[PDB]
RNA sequence: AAACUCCAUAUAUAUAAUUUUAAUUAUAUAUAAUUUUAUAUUAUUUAUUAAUAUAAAGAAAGGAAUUAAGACAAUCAUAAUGAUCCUUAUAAUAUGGGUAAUAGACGUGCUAUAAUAAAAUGAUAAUAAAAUUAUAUAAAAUAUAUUUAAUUAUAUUUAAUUAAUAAUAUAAAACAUUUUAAUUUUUAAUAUAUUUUUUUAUUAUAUAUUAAUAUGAAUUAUAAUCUGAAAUUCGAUUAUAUGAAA
């Protein structure tokens, strides 16, 4: 239940296909400052997700519309060679070479 | 490309002795910038000279190395860098979810000052 | 005038459909379609019977863009994987609610015409909605009925009722005696000014009399509700309700009609839409257990998530906009337990049979008969048709002059 | 021929298109609302209309600002520009473009229609 | 789409709070864009080069 | 020494060849079969709407009269329908030579083994 | 297709007289032979012009009707061919033959 | 056309003196928007060369001062 | 000059732990052709030959840049040097205006004048390439125009990416269906059909008309929006209305 609430509250920052939650910040002038800022937000998001005393957002289904828009901008080569077309009996068969067989002994 | 490839080869040699597994240099797509300069005739004769600039790119990846050793690599190759080569380094640090001690804009300040000045307070009076 | 009595003035698609170009076709003697003796006609090209042709022309089973004008009368290949498989499920399945799917031009309409041919032979009353777009495009009159609380379409209903009367055997219709008394306003131009109303008493008049009632346009919606109710209460004759191009209904939730507030009218607020979905959903139950409901999609219509979700092929996505997902239609289809029958593509042996019939019909070009080996032709036409598509096969043979 | 408020229409003409074609001030969107309000189906033609329905169209058309009334509003807005002495008013008086168009070339239509008593 | 708007608004508000984002449900023009645009002065003022060159 | 190694069928009996036309590319898998073709996982009539494009793909198999003797799994990217269809045509011809190297001369004579060099030329 | 090729072979003129601006004096009208690709162009343009006089809105229908009439013997473009061949027979002596 | 939500194009002008004394307001702010207060006051509006005298009416509110001080002379040809 | 050289194309090797994925790719190096050979025919300077065709091998088919002189043109608002003239002005700054004026004429474009062609619709989303994003590119969502929704425009909010990663951006035509004035070639009411998305019959379905329509989108009214400190002279966009010439 808390995992579902976490994914709902992340909104566009969660990709269901890959299960990755990614957030970036360059608001501050130093990387250390920006790293803490992201860390603090992560703790806040986790605390809210693990506090299911008032609302768990279980009725609300996960929204993937942002991920769908991203997928339409990348070409998907999701087709593989049919397995029932494979003809393993037509593959070349290793020939017997006495020289290589004799050079190994 | 010539200095880029030579320097890339040197980085692989530096990493090996440091104990850093390295992959590459992977060639990335070359960027081409173009500019056309119309010449004095502009009569549709040989009246447009063309120019271009190619950015050659190489990616070297480091694996399974401690941060201290990785910094030694960057320091050494920086000390002995070649002319006309630029370098960007993305470091990836795996961390724990909860850490210890962690890892106001100029315009907003001036707005508050302006809204307190008499030229603005004289109107906000209710 | 520029147009003479016999001049071909329409566009190509309408000219081929309407110009009676089959008159010059050569008469061939083919076996007749009979499901009771399918063993003798399986995997063979057959013509329909004289009783079947008359009914199917009145039902709209044959459509334009089917190269029907190449042959004296429309013909069909009795297939084992499509025709025999579907008709056996229709006779055995207890629910008897099907939706025919498949890629564009695979032969979904022809399969429905073969199901109509079976029904004619098996003494059933067929109610066909060939082109549902005619009651959703806003090109005929509409009126609101207060007693039905639905928007009735008199012009369309007049045509539909005549099709149900002219396409079905009068004897079957006469057998169904009426269960209730009905009174309508008289529009018969002979006694309309003498008899204000026409009464149909129960147990005396039949559903044949009900289908011949001439009423005013405003009372024609109440005549369509009586006809359907009478056919759904009787248990003597099975009723086969069919709808071709049903994809148009699923993807056009809102008709072109607008109410008095300039708001487009929901399709289920039309009597035709409500009636169609009541039979599909199961709200209108037929007493006879051999009654069926065969729907067919068409590739000329847009596709969306409505039908795939209703058939269980994809999960429900709640955030899909209503223009690409109509949850009310999904509920109705799943309430009726509608099952999918995907029309398979033709195999190479079926292509051989069709091309052998085409050779005997003299429809093949001279480049495919002279100097070409028969086996080469079959292999080439099976490859150029997408490995079975009947429509791409015909086009490669008669509409590819390159 | 069907006559609505003097305008004559050929029988085959579609009502929603004909209304937006012969009546000043009524366009496509306005014509559709009139037909929807009167219960005329989207592609009904003029010859189908009955006399009660022809009177209903005239009634709804007479409760709108069309024909002279609409044309007077444009003529009075143009006159106001000239009365106040605005730059635009002078352009209307001089039969010149009033929307910033160049006049070194073209400007033929402005020289033909721009006037204080605009049609 | 079937998710009640009230439920989707509660998620938006809570999400905005966690991520320090401005929640403006009404849509009133607030000028927040002006407060977030980057300062281009330093780049613009260096167009002609560094003035502190040896002469 | 030379830089050419005899081409042979792979572990599954498939001949793999690549073809290019304009900006399009095609990688086809030819195996002995019954004339089944798939383009990017889709039926031929679905992917290629023009019958002339379909006839271009079939031409190499028609030259060796082996239209019903092979199954083709074609994958294509770039350019448009014509470039992809003819890139597949070129790739099938190059993949058919492994099954019978004696037919290369007939394929060359038909013109299906020649890479079409024409591409969009920036006006000069 | 066989009907189309037969109609094109019967309607197209075998030769056509062309004016050559040879010499400062008047140009010479000399009969010239036509190849098969040039013959088909002349006959096709005649067919298209005849087709576009028919009533159908669809060019395919008008073209189909025109081609059917030509395959059945009736065409007004056979007069054009006879007039191109008459001119050439008149100027037979103007040919050069070297 | 300035967006209505932004408000009028208000410029610094000496309106108090023109309302207590009746003096004309000489200005080059041709972009200025004629506010409803200006009604009745006398303005001298630059046109690039001279200052055109104009008194504001109620039908001029919303327009801009520049609209009433033409900057070009009517065209004429040496026919 | 040519050769050479580079680019393109074909091939080989190397690189990528094939999630920066396009391995059907990226970019370094190398190889290849200024193709080669047999045969018949026709010419020849007839021989160890060209033009031809025939057969065989081959992926092989296209481009780029390139010398020095001679005679002549341009102010270069695209760099100079001198002379010459201004030096409270011919130098410098600010506010506003102009460069956008309009009789005629000319060049170059855009959109049109309809049916081998225009308009709608097409969501498990037909099919590209080359570019751009720290003086940014802006996703999805929500709100309004505005209607169930979509579409289009803007606002609200500012996800990701400073990039083979994320965004601009689901390319478009194509193809399919529907519609389309002139056109009584239509539509409607009845009857009719073994053309049913349709046929036939009988009635009505206007005249006007060499002509401008449901073609065309100039001009113009009103309201709103975008950029900017500012859109009056003098910007862009949207909605309703207007609908010229052709
Ligand atoms: N069994 C068959 N025997 C003969 N011809 C057939 C058969 N099946 C299909 N055809 C032919 O294939 C073509 C397409 O058939 P049909 O119209 O039934 O396809 P469909 O899938 O319903 O098409 P759409 O997707 O356009 O609705 C027609 O020319 C039809 O005559
Ligand atoms: K109008
Ligand atoms: K101007
Ligand atoms: K001009
Ligand atoms: K890959
Ligand atoms: K200016
Ligand atoms: K057009
Ligand atoms: K694209
Ligand atoms: K302006
Ligand atoms: Mg961010
Ligand atoms: Mg989008
Ligand atoms: Mg991308
Ligand atoms: Mg069908
Ligand atoms: Mg200028
Ligand atoms: Mg796509
Ligand atoms: Mg968006
Ligand atoms: Mg698309
Ligand atoms: Mg389109
Ligand atoms: Mg005119
Ligand atoms: Mg228009």
Numbering used by the authors:
A (entry chain Y): 214 to 318
B (entry chain J): 52 to 154, 180 to 202
C (entry chain W): 49 to 450
D (entry chain M): 2 to 120
E (entry chain X): 1 to 55
F (entry chain I): 140 to 263
G (entry chain G): 150 to 247
H (entry chain S): 9 to 87
The authors write:
In the SSU-METTL17 complex, the 72-kDa factor is found in the cleft between the head and the body and its presence prevents a monosome formation. In contrast to previously characterised SSU assembly factors, METTL17 binds exclusively to the rRNA of the head, and the binding involves both the N-terminal domain (NTD) and the C-terminal domain (CTD). Thus, h31 is more exposed, and the rRNA nucleotide A1100 in h34 is flipped out. The unique feature of the embedded [Fe4S4]2+ cluster in our structure is that it brings together residues that are 140 amino acids apart, thus stabilizing the N- and C-terminal domains of METTL17 when it’s bound to the SSU.
The mitoribosome is essential for the intra-organellar translation of the 13 mtDNA encoded OXPHOS subunits in humans, directly supporting the formation of Complexes I, III, IV and V. Indeed, without intra-organellar translation, mitochondrial respiration cannot occur. METTL17 is a highly conserved mitochondrial matrix protein that has recently been linked to mitochondrial translation. We then grouped particles from the two datasets and resolved the structures of the SSU, SSU-METTL17, and SSU-mtIF3 at an overall resolution of 2.3 Å, 2.6 Å, and 2.8 Å, respectively.
